[PDB]
Amino acid sequence: MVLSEGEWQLVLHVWAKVEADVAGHGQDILIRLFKSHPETLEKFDRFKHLKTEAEMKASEDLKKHGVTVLTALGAILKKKGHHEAELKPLAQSHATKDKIPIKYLEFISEAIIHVLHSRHPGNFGADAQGAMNKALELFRKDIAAKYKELGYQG
Numbered sequence: 001m002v003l004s005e006g007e008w009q010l011v012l013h014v015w016a017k018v019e020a021d022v023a024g025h026g027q028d029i030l031i032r033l034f035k036s037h038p039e040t041l042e043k044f045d046r047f048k049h050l051k052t053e054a055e056m057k058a059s060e061d062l063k064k065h066g067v068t069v070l071t072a073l074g075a076i077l078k079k080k081g082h083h084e085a086e087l088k089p090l091a092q093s094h095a096t097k098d099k100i101p102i103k104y105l106e107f108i109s110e111a112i113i114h115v116l117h118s119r120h121p122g123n124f125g126a127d128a129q130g131a132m133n134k135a136l137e138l139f140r141k142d143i144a145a146k147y148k149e150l151g152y153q154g
């Protein structure tokens with residue numbers, strides 16, 4: 001009732017390429033986020049001490065968090081819009097535990113698209129970029145609704 005079947009299949013086709021190397025893609029995506037929007041780094045008490053790109057690449061903890069982030073997102077994408085159960089705990093941990101504005105989810109969405117385009121251009125042309133953009137838009141709209149339900153405006 002938001003993406004068409006064909007759009008979902010484009011999303012899952014490129015996501016399969018991510019799955020070939022989750023740790024690498026995860027690392028790349030978090031570094032791209034922090035490099036482009038340094039203010040996001042302040043939300044992470046465990047990585048705030050990291051001062052250069054090399055130190056980031058070498059950090060076991062950052063790489064582990066990358067896998068955690070992408071595992072969770074992939075589980076959501078594979079639901080093709082039917083992600084209520086999976087989305088609710090994610091909203092709670094980003095709305096009460098830690099307070100992550102919708103703006104910053106926008107920033108990490110841009111980082112994901114940047115990295116997919118950098119690594120898989122042959123499989124991420126305009127139609128695929130559009131489909132992925134839509135799926136990340138849907139993720140953001142629905143987590144924003146859950147944010148509000150919990151008392152956080154986002």
Ligand code: HEM
Pocket residue numbers: 040041043044045046068069070072073089090093094097098100104105108
């Ligand atoms: C595609 C978007 C994202 C996904 C799928 C995601 C997912 C997760 C997951 C699975 C965890 C671990 C436990 C939990 O659920 O809290 C986590 C933790 C966290 N996330 Fe996110 N996250 C996303 C975006 C962000 C953004 C944009 C920020 C901050 C700029 C952020 C900040 C954090 C923080 C501060 C923690 C706690 C880590 C710790 O200290 O152990 N997340 N995230």
